[model samples]
Target: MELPRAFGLLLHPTSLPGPYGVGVLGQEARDFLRFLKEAGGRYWQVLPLGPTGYGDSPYQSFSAFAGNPYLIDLRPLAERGYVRLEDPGFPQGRVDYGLLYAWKWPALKEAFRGFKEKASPEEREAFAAFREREAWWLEDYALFMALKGAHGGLPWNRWPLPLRKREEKALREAKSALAEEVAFHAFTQWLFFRQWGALKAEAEALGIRIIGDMPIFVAEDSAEVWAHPEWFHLDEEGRPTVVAGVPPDYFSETGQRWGNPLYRWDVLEREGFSFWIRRLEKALELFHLVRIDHFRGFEAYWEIPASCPTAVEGRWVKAPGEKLFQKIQEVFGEVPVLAEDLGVITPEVEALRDRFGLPGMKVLQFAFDDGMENPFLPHNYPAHGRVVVYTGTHDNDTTLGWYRTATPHEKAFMARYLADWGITFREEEEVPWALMHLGMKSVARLAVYPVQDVLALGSEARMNYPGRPSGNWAWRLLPGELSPEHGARLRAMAEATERL
Candidate 1:
């Protein structure tokens, strides 16, 4: 899959500042897409659209196939008469997930009821169409969420024995009891898709493509694991025998006990990779380009026992990722894939990525942190294959933040390198420009930057810190952060580098 020779920013909608707590699939999101097109951006990338779990991270989503309802715009619902413009006006600033969980959900539940009761004939037809089209994944996901609420959001493992083990009789009874909740959850899914699809079409008319991400592992408590017990390394108690994680390197000393379930690839193969194929099919309807998260996990995953507290004790286990991709092609046809093959990549991992003609990622933040022979360095990048070069991803600091904190020795190297170009980094914005220029000049087919870097934000706006939990993923872009002058500077640079 060849990417456009273009550059864009990675800004999740949650970070688009809103009067209703968090950003939504409404006016603000569409406006941002328009801003990207005017700023010479061909793409806008975001993290998973799934419903998040503990810590509210996109990667910790409860359903891979479901969209986050927290992002549904209240303004539109108000327009539909489901929500009143002044009623239950949520915290006007940053999202208060506590209020969100208690107030927003029940409010949406009320809206769901109102929608069903008063829907126009056309709206009814649209709802039925969406339900029919998404039946395969939607049914399982809606039931999962319904049951989750019934159990008060307990991990699936802790449910009553029969239900926890998914005994058919128990499941049927539980379904009967939770029928209303299931319908409401399903309605939320319908709303999210309807709003987002319309927004995406608007972006298409503007010549900007939406980019999306996918986590390699499924959440342990998700509908996928609950429905397909054979597809994961889970015990009879519905607990993972071995979970997913990454070994210690730059991220953490204890590594990352991500706690997502590890796939039983053998079972996936025996099933002819149907779930994987359907996932690709469904997700393709959402975005033009898909960047798979933790792409190296496909080559080999760090498998840790469910009993392990931290990821430091995990072991590498080979997965049948290549076979899975091959089967996906057979089912969904050629996939436009971008492999996030960063952090401790090996030759075998690179081989898997290359064999599938998937573009691998390169981050300039890691390039100079070490010295030479770094694949992230422009001089060493493999030009022929696909690569998505970036000054920084959501996980890294802005170039200026990084420079201020670098070791004296490393700082000197960067200073000297800039001096060699007769461009000394004097101001904070200069820092990002220097790195952005390097990314644009690279041989990679695509160049991307976090919106933080473009705005010259410091560590405060950094999206994630690999190991840190709270306060991460909270940085919202203030209005007018990307100004006309900023667009002109980026447009000039992009045109000169032939990356527009």
Candidate 2:
């Protein structure tokens, strides 16, 4: 599946400017589509839209299939008399997840009560149909959420033995007892899908396709792990035997000990990769293209013992990447996917990525320090059209922020590289623009710029810091920060690069 020459902006919906503390699916989302269209963007890349759990990271989600209820627009509900609009006086410029959780969930609950009381026959039927159609994952997710709440938000593994083991009688009784709570969760998912569907349609109408990010691993406390223990490396008590993470790499000296339960590939293969098929199918429904984070894991992954404190003690284990992708291809037939092929990639990883014809990523932030041989350097890319160039990613600092903290050697190399490409910046403030212009002019099929870099924001606007647990994924676009002039400038760059 060859990609067309195009450009896009990387901005998660959570970052979009809004009055509701965080971005929601409302007129603002539609306005963003207009902004993308005006900027001559064909893609709007976003992070996972899943319900974030601990640490408020999208990667560590409660359920792979569930949407974050906080992202559901309350304005529509208020207008429909389901909720009363009120200002919580949320601080602008960043998301206050604590404040959002405190204020939004109760409003959603109120909206659910309003829905139960006032939903028309057609609306009720539609909601019911959505539930029925998505029952494959929705049932388990809703029940899991209800059970978590009943247990005061304890991890599923820490729940009572009967419940944790999913005893038939206990589950049935719990379902009956918590039926209202289950319905509430399902209701939130319905609202999320409804709003997202409308927003997606609006984007499609404007010729903008969305590229969504999918983390390679699920959270330890996720519905998938709770419901399907056989598909993961879990012990008798349902604790992970081995966890997922990368070995010591660019991001950290001790490496990241991401406590996600590792998948049992042998079990998954025996099941004909049905779990992955369903997961990817769901992802494709919400996005025009899906970028798989940690794509190298498909070839081989670092397996860290659960008891290990850090990822430094992990070892590499090979995975059946060819078989998995073959199954995916057979099931989905040439699906649009982008491989996040970064971090200590080996020849085997490159082979697997190329075998699937998936475009890999090139981060300009990684290019300056690695000399001319760096894969991230545009000149070193094996094939121009087989890669997507980016000024930086969500995990990296904004371009301006990176420039501010870069070492003198790196800064010198960057300046020389830009000069060699006929791109010159008079002031440090122009660094972001220089990088964006360089990315646009690169031969890669797609060029994506994070909105922070496009706006030339400093570290304050950085979306995520790789190893940080909290205070990440909180950056927000303040109102009026993204103006028509920004759009015009980007469009002109796209036109100049033949990406328009």
Candidate 3:
């Protein structure tokens, strides 16, 4: 399942500009795919498609199997007479999450009410089929969401002992009492998938494939952990005794304390990683290929105590790595997975990645830190071509900003390295595209760069800052931002690289 030599843009749908407070699975999504095809791009790599739980981060999702209800396109819903949203009064630029939730929730509920009252038999049949197929996880997820509302939106760990322990009598009572809320959650998911299915077909017709992300860890507050406590290291109270994080790596001096519960690999082994397998099955349906974030964690992960103030006190723990991937391989032969094998990788991690024949990532932004020996350097790639070359990732400062803040020595080294490779830039304004040109020209089979870098934007437009959690993932495209001139320039580069 080797990827074709192609180029793509890394943009989250939330970043697409629209009249709504957030980008959605509607006309804007279709327009973006058309733009990508016109620009000779073949892929649209996005962040995780799951519903964000806390801090507006996609990585911390409410459920691994659930679609982001926030991404559902309401315009079509309104047109169908499901709901009325007269003059949404959305702001022009970035999404205001608080504002969106306040406006969207009631509208969605109204739509659900309307659908329940008036859905045609065909639509009802379709919804029933989706529900029956997804019930294994959907049942728990819907109930989890319903109970969260019942308990003032508190984490499952904070719920009453009867519910937190999932006592049979209590759960049954809660399920019956909160039946309407559970139905609402399911209704939202149906709406999301309905819109996404249409949009995905459009992308297919445009010769554009989607690359979706899967994070290594699940959030502590997620239905994933709450429903399957045996798969995680949770205490009697159903709280994580240990959490997930990396120790003193990139992004922080103390490192990031992600506060996600650690997995009990032995339990997962007993279950044959069935949760992961079904998760992948759903992911494959939504994406042409998938990128496993923090692929190194499969070999070994940083384990931090739940009581630890920061990630500085974490320890490395080994995981069942290839044993799990072998099972996945058995299920889906030659799985099209890309490994996010960046940051503090060891020989074992690389070995596991190569053994699975999954492509690993290379960021040009990391190359100048060292000489040609840096694995991120284009010339340093292995003879076998299984790599996704990128100017920078979502977490990176935009290329223009990276160059702007680079040390004089680093800049000099970059210039000399680019010159050695017969590359040059006319001015600072050209730096982002210049780096993109280098990526496209690389021996790697696939090249993708952030949308911000494509526009040569500064740090202000950077998608995420790992060190600071909030006020990120809010950058949005301006209307008419991807001009014909931009597409033509991108087309010329992909054409020159023979990657179209």
Candidate 4:
């Protein structure tokens, strides 16, 4: 699907400024939407909104369909006489997930109790309808969460044999025993969706669209895997036989071992790709445009044996991309999707992406290292409007940070390249804006800058360091950091580039 020329900012909602430890779908969110509108942005791109598990990574969610309860604002609940209005004295400027977990869950539980006891008839009815409408996934997810809590958060494989195997009698008994906990989990989801709907409506009113990310694979310990072991490459004991990862590449001698359970594609195909269809269906409900992370996985994926310690030992396996996308189109025609065709891309991967007319990605930070013919360079793009151009992404350093550490050759090449376009910067501090200008003038249909680059932040503000396991996804925007001057500058750039 072709996209109109536009601009956007890449910021996960977790980074939005707030007083209560983390950003929530409340006043701060609406304020950010106003800022986006003021900056002439048409899109607000965010990472996955799922409830994070270990490492606090959104990609490794407990449930693909559930929202993070930490992101639900408590002020609304206070107004409704659920939670009391009081600051928990969380440190500002960064999210402390430990504090959030300790405080937010109990607060949410209190709200759930209040909801059960004091919710008006209409409100109770709406909650009941939400449960019914989403029962296809919600029932299993709620039960799975309750079971996890009961087992003290152990992975399903480590649970007792009957529960781990999901024996009918055991499950029936457990459901009856943990009924209150299951209802609480479902209640959190209802609150999440209700707030999200309000936030999305406000975004739409401002003519802004939300672009959401979807990781290609689910966590091995996720609700889906625990409930539908038949859909993954799991052993009889419910452990992954073959996992997902990439092979060694230029960036690393031993590539990333993502450890997500590989899907049983034959079984998925036999079922008519209904699982994938439902996943996309849920994504489309929450986002105006969905970007599929690691789009190459759909064409052919690198399969690493579960016994391997690293990604050094892996093999490429073919996937039924065409068939899956065909099924998706048949179910939801002309869906808006962006392909993350970033690493180790081959002709087959490009073919799969282009076959479905999905726009790929180009990062300005990768443009200079490989010379003029690099596909990441704007001039080397296969065609205008077939890609989304970004200054950098969540995984990369902020543009200013990258410039500070760039090799001399890279710096010289970037300087010369910008000079060719009549864009020159005398100091390293100006590099971020120079790259943003280049991206704004690129042939790609969409130009996006990470909020860090927009603020000219350095490595301290970088969102993620790919291989590092922890201390990532904790960056937060302090209140008043995004001033009107920043918005004015962005608006001027958008207007000058015909993006407004």
Candidate 5:
């Protein structure tokens, strides 16, 4: 798909400032949209919005199709008389997922109770419509949630024998016993999607489009994998025979063992790739554009043994990209998509990306690797406009932090390059702005930077550190940190670069 010259900040909605220990789809999100418009940003890129489970990582969601109930704003429910409480006295600047998981659902359950007792006819009708329309995914997801709760939050594989095997009689009996719990789960999703729809509309009104991220694989413990074992390479006992990961890369010597279940491509293909189609459709419902994480998986993937401690034992396996994409094309004629075509890319993967005309990504942090031959450098970028450049990504250190840690040789080379263009090299203090300028001025049709980079924050604000098992995806924007002065400067840069 063709794209216009544009740039935006890369911050997940969860990082938006709010009083709820984490961001919620309420006034804060709308205010952030206004800030984006004021800053002349056209996009609000985010990580996945799915219900994160064990790792508290969006990438490791419990259900691919369900919204994170933890993000539901209590303010709206309070106004509607469904919930009432003084503030939980959440501290600003970072999420307390533990506190939230314990406190949030009780209030949401109160809202569900209020809705059941006092919802008006029109509201009830709308809720009914939502339930009916989303039945395909919602029914399974709700049941999955109820079961998860019943099992004391254990993964499905750890459940009783009958339920673990998904025996029909067991499922029917469990559903009957857990009816109210399932309804409560469904009600939470209704609240979540309703709030998100309003936020998306507000962003559109402000001329800002959302770019939502979708990891290519599903967690082995996810509802989709549990409900549909045939869709993935799961053993009869429900454990993944092979899992997902990347080979040794810049992030880790042993590489990242993501532990997500590998798909059974043959089974998916025989089923006409309906799963992927539905997944993409769900993404489109929430975003103006979808950025597929680890896009190379569509062509081929590293299939790691599930028992392997590291990704070093993985083997390269081919996937049915041609068939899968053809099916997608048949369903959705044109997809507004972005390809996260970074990390150990192969020629075949590049070809698949180009075949779909999806704009691959470029990061300035990776540009100064060696010489002019480094494709990440702006000069080596293709003349065509099928790329989205970034000052740095969520996985990368803040641009200022990256500059601080850059090797002496890399720094000197960067300095020389800036000097050739008559640009100042102010080290850490000004490197973020310099790189943002470089990205905006590039020929790529789109450019983005993490909110941390925009604020000239240091390494402490880095959103994620790839290959680390914990202490990631926790960075948050402090309240009042995005100032009008910042907006003005960003606007000027965008306008001057013809990206406004």
Candidate 6:
């Protein structure tokens, strides 16, 4: 997997400015790709594109197979007489996800109705084929979504015991009762794939490979756990006995108690990892490259008892690391996987990653705290490894924003570090440029920068901060921020680093 010596900005579609609040898979994404292409970028990396969960996090999506319905392009559907888009007054600024849920959802439902009432045989055939091909996860996901709708989006724990436990009779009966709702969800996914597929083809035509992300853990209420409770540490009532979280690192005193349930790898292996294989195979169908989020979880995971409220009480639990990857390899040999080897990495995790010749990540921000001897310091990186270098991730502040807030000692250290590289920051807007240069010059095969850095935003435009719930993942791209000047500077940085 030889990536370019260039760095492309990481911007989730939700953050892109669009009408109807959040960004769509429409003109904005295409324009952003055009900017990257013109700026000499080779990759467009994105976070998980699945349907978001609480606090609208893409990482804690409800399903691994289904695409985000909120990202479905409404204009085309309306123009094609599927629904009246005029009903959802698409806000032209920062996404009010609340508004999207309120307006866009009903519009989607109406569109599904229209399609059902007035559809061509070819269109129906396409939808049928999509269901047939993706039934592995899609069937369960559709049912989960439909069930959620029935429960007014309440957590699955609150559902009836029979359905929650997925009793055979109840499950079969509920499927029929919720058949229309399930079909509505399946239809929305069909349209999303149709639009996203076309956009993907266009990107591929322009030599842009879309690298997608997959979270290692699924949400406890997610379709994966809900449809197959045996695959999680859930009790008889369908509640998790244990949940996932990191112990007091990069977050808070109490630690972030990520309430998502930990997987029962024992059950997963018992079934020959059918779920994992299907998940990866589905993602590989859509994306060119894959980045596994919380990659350390594969080797060992922090498991907090569901009875505990904070992650500080968690203990590291060993998972079927190599076995899972081995099964994946058995299914799809030489998969293009980027191990997000961040945070507290256990030694065994490193061995598993290296065994598969997977690329690890090196964040430039992490390098600054440590000395030059740190592998993240770029100069110390092994040249033989596959690595993705980043100035700062969506989880961190913008390059300049972080710099401004750095302590005097940190400032001095960074100043000296840059001096060692014979580079000095002259303009405030040049931070991204400096970071871009650092990433491109690093031994990492793939390098990425968050899009906010390109505009040199302050803390206000930063995407996500670890452990924080509200107000994260809500930044937007301002129009014309990626103009010729931005392109030229990025191109120059690429050229300077021999990225092309």
Q: Local error of candidate 6 at 288, Å?
A: 1.5
TM-score of 4: 0.98
Model 3 quality (TM-score) = 0.97
Per-residue alpha-carbon lDDT of candidate 5 for residues 72-174, written as tens digits (9 for 90 to 100): 8878878888777455776677777777777787877888888888788887888888899999899889988899999999889889979988899999999
lDDT of each: 0.80, 0.89, 0.87, 0.88, 0.85, 0.81
lDDT of residue 440 for candidate 4: 81
lDDT of 4 by residue, 1-500 (tens): 86788899998888989878888898788898999999999899999899887799888898888888888888788788987755578877678898888888888888888888889989999999999999989998899899998999998877888988899999999999999999999999998988998899999999998998989999888888888999999998889998998899777799878889999999999999878899988888888889988999999999999999899889999999989998888889875789999866889888888988989999989888867987888787766587999999998889999998988888899989998877888778789989898888888888988889888988888888887877788888988899988889988889988998
Order of all candidates by lDDT, from best down to worst? 2, 4, 3, 5, 6, 1
Q: Model 5 scores what on Cα lDDT?
A: 0.85
Best by lDDT: 2
Look at candidate 4 and give me any clashing residue pairs. none
lDDT per residue, candidate 1, 36-59, as tens digits? 888888888888888977677888
lDDT of 1 at 10: 88
Q: What is the Å distance of residue 328 in model 3 from its true position?
A: 0.3
Candidate 2 residue spans exceeding 4 A from truth? 249-253
How does candidate 2 fare on TM-score?
Answer: 0.98
* Model 6 global lDDT (CA atoms, 0 to 1): 0.81
Candidate 5: deviation at residue 485, Å?
1.1
lDDT of 3 by residue, 270-314 (tens): 899998888888888899989988889999999999999899889
Q: Distance from true position, residue 21, model 5, in Å?
A: 1.0
